[PDB]
Nucleic acid binder design. Sequence first.
RNA 1: GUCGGGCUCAUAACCCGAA
RNA 2: AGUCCCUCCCGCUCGGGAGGGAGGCACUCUGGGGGGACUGCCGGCGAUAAGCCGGAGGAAGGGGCGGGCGACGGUAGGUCAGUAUGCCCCGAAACCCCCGGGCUACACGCGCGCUACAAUGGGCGGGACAAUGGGUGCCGACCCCGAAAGGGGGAGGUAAUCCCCUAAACCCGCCCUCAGUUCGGAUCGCGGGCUGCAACUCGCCCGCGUGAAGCUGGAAUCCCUAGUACCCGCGCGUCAUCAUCGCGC
Lengths: 135, 149, 61, 141, 65, 214, 100
Amino acid sequence: MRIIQTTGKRKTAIARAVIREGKGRVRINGKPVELVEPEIARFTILEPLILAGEEIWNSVDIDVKVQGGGFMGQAEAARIAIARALVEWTGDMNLKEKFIKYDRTMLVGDPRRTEPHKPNRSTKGPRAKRQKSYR
Amino acid sequence: ATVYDVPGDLLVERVAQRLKEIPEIKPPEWAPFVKTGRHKERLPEQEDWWYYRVASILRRVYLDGPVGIERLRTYYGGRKNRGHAPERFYKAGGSIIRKALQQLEAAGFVEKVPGKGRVITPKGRSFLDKIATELKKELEEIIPELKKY
Amino acid sequence: CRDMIVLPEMVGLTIYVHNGKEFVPVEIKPEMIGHYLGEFAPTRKRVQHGAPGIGATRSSM
Amino acid sequence: DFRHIVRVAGVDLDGNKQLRWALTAIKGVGINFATMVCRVAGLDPFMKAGYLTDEQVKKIEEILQDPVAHGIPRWAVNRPKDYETGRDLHLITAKLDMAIREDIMRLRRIRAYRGIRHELGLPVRGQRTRSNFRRGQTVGV
Amino acid sequence: DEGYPAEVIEIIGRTGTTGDVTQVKVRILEGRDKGRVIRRNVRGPVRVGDILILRETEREAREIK
Amino acid sequence: AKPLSERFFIPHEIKVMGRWSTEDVEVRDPSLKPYINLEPRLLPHTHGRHAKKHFGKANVHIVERLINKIMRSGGSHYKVAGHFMRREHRSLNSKKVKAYEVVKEAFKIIEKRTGKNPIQVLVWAIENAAPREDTTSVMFGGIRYHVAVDISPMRRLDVALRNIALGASAKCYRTKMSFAEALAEEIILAANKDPKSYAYSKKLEIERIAESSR
Amino acid sequence: QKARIKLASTNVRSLEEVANQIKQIAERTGVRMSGPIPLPTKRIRIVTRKSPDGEGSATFDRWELRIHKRLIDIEADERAMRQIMRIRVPEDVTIEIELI
RNA sequence: GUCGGGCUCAUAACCCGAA
RNA sequence: AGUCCCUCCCGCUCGGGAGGGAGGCACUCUGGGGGGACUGCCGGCGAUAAGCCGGAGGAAGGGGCGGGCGACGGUAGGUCAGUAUGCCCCGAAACCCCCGGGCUACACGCGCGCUACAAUGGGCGGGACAAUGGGUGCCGACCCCGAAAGGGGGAGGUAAUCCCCUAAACCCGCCCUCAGUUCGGAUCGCGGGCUGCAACUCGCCCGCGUGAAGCUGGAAUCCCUAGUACCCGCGCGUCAUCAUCGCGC
Ligand SMILES: [Mg+2]
Ligand SMILES: [Mg+2]
Ligand SMILES: [Mg+2]
Ligand SMILES: [Mg+2]
Ligand SMILES: [Mg+2]
Ligand SMILES: [Mg+2]
Ligand SMILES: [Mg+2]
Ligand SMILES: [Mg+2]
Ligand SMILES: [Mg+2]
Ligand SMILES: [Mg+2]
Ligand SMILES: [Mg+2]
Ligand SMILES: [Mg+2]
Ligand SMILES: [Mg+2]
Ligand SMILES: [Mg+2]
Ligand SMILES: [Mg+2]
Ligand SMILES: [Mg+2]
Ligand SMILES: [Mg+2]
């Protein structure tokens, strides 16, 4: 009974995924992945499964728990977790080489974070400033 | 099949239609005349909005119980247009929510946990999950990917 | 006492309400019931404007 | 059956509009109050105004004559606790205008601060007047 | 009517009032002077291996310092 | 309204938005070919990772470039067809989901109206809207003069995309037409060289001014 | 039959020293001692305008005070409780002992 | 010609709007 | 998360879910210590120096990214109305308290913003996903009453334990269809509340009614190079009550 765990992060969202042999069921916080909305979020999660192919997809079950961030941050973190779990579970280098070509961030992640805000119109952002007048 | 397996809005619609058969669910006498909160502008446009609100509250108790009036008031609030001032968030009122919870308890679907709020009874869980099963059966005729679940 | 509320027993009397520098006379009528006394003793003088001075416009400075 | 113009309480109403929005052409009746009166009359707020009958128009005029006695709550009328009689009243058109004029005149007769603000045409609800509320032409130096 | 394509082979330098122009050497690929190398002034980012569509091939830019 | 089969759509192949393949799409102009990216890809959303590196935008799929182009207000500090179009609190700045849906609906309308693959029609439009000659400014005696120059292919592509977006923006401003319909109309008109297209007319005007200043 | 020890300080080194001494005492005897658990640091940030007057560009100071914390569990045995009760922490350290 | 606003450290010249 | 027990649901149970308890520190997280990047490796330009340009590998590549720390001086720049201080003045008032006013006035010129002029929308019902901070002169779950604002009781919390705290922009369905309108919400009438010793001058909130200018802006002119700008809400300061502001998320 194999159980494999993986982790993914994207701008304060954190996702933990578990994978084992199954029938093709993928749930996100208890919901089937086929019913995630909006469509742009749904396609974000589904890309690694489509890349892997129908044979591999239908032979496993994946459960993902994700918290923090927003609806686009959570989709990308789950995508990273699923891709890492798929490369570790099947252990073949053609699929891993396929992920790096299509999207490197799938396996290496994204380190970007918000820049802290500064005085002169602090609430708007680090660089935006008040309009300047001379008379 | 459970509540977790179907889209929320479609389930609320089906449950609202099925709730009209329970004699213990009846709109109050002031229902024709009120708004649902200080952040709204106009009255509800559906003549049968009471049943939709009751069904939404029941599904909310199912998913997040035990839960009380104040937190539900947070959930049903929203953004308000304030004329020349910027928009802001505000809570909803309490009379609608409290009356809906009392009616649901009268029907036996929810019950009171002391100092903690209200929770779904086995009868209410069966009532919701049966309708969810029926909706999922119809749903997977046109989305074959939902048969595996 | 500018914050005193006018009551029905005060109707018919005359009361001198301070406005900052002088006591001004107020005669209580029945339709005054429920209003503060200060509402009938203005504290500011009506404005009658004169000619704008030097610096009142960009080209006058 | 269909009429393009229907007169209700002495106002010509559009016949192609929904009843709830058509009723707002009356001064004294906004959308919320109009929906309330449509619901009390037992009429669909979304039906076209041009399908009304004579008995329905009579019933609407009766409701507008005395809404409180027909089941509309006392907190929904535009003149609760009338200054003269003390009842909860609702007014439309000329009566509404004359009641407002009487209120302002009563303020002016006792020489209250608000009445003086009304007379001089200046803001009455505590606003600052140095910067905004300018209506005129520039003075020269 | 459809211009003549030319391939950039060397970058010379920046010019223009605000530095917005680049001078290059190009080789004509089609037409009467196919094979001729001429220098031209270009607006926009450009690198070795790009292809321009000249509407005529008889004007040559003045050599810059 | 929208059928449930379209609300919950599950694709199984790698193609643009799970609905259109670009295998038969051809690019006729030899200068624009290495800069119009058509490599197979399902979701056109790269999260702005290309702008940091020089010439990075070359390897960005053309549909995502179009989506990025429409995610804007339109008329901030210059006039389009005689007007500023300042939309502010009701613009599409930073709302990528709505722009994505606009592009999707425009593609469906295009395919229904012409019977061809929408990507091909878009390619034809950008080919017809890309200028070949422009001008640079000089100053003498307090008078401004034009001098004709050539245009690099990346700038040609950027200008064509910008003008297509601006034409669509102008066609839906304070009129009964919707944004998706206006975009489909602008693309179709530019594909056929109709002077009713904003981008094609702009393209002709730029070339005329460049020609008369050699 | 277990005692809970809470520690707090503005200095990391002293806090570490006290925890290590308690750990040595718990090692010197047959007794299990749950390791020192680090609780989140408390941060006190105050932002102030720099100039005494109001002329010139506005500029600000961001002053910070940091208070570190630890938690230690041990089983209340008198042979071990006497040694820990006779330890003296530096004056810049708060120590609180309770029995649960 | 009158009044108001731009440009300038400021004034003159210059630009814009209005009656 | 995997594992054991108990209870309740579903297509009646081969299978799929949800609570509670035993149990564990795996995973997330918290915070002490350590590793990692050096123009180190490769190819060019320059001199064979200083360096520069382009590649690999890499979480990260050329002050890696964002901040704190501002030399000798000048500016008779600002501040004696934060506190310290020389001289000159008042010293039965220019010192000390109490009451009522004023700083909130209004033909008009200007700065910085907010809300709009609508479909790249307005309304009505339904569905989603945060982080920073703060709490005993206080934060208050949970129950009851009220149409709303609010009112009556009150668990837990001196806090990784309890609370503020189920954000909005976004998505689904229906009405409106280019109109000064179902756009906009200034202005005003009547009524209901809260804080406070006091609400007229001169506070904030809620219900019904009322419905001004505005249909994209001359000459000019501002901010910004990446998780940046735009768009969206939220926390803290001030604070009895009061945020179109400041500092942050
Ligand atoms: Mg930011
Ligand atoms: Mg909502
Ligand atoms: Mg608005
Ligand atoms: Mg706003
Ligand atoms: Mg001058
Ligand atoms: Mg640095
Ligand atoms: Mg000086
Ligand atoms: Mg000065
Ligand atoms: Mg002042
Ligand atoms: Mg409106
Ligand atoms: Mg809504
Ligand atoms: Mg109107
Ligand atoms: Mg009043
Ligand atoms: Mg007042
Ligand atoms: Mg007008
Ligand atoms: Mg218009
Ligand atoms: Mg201030």
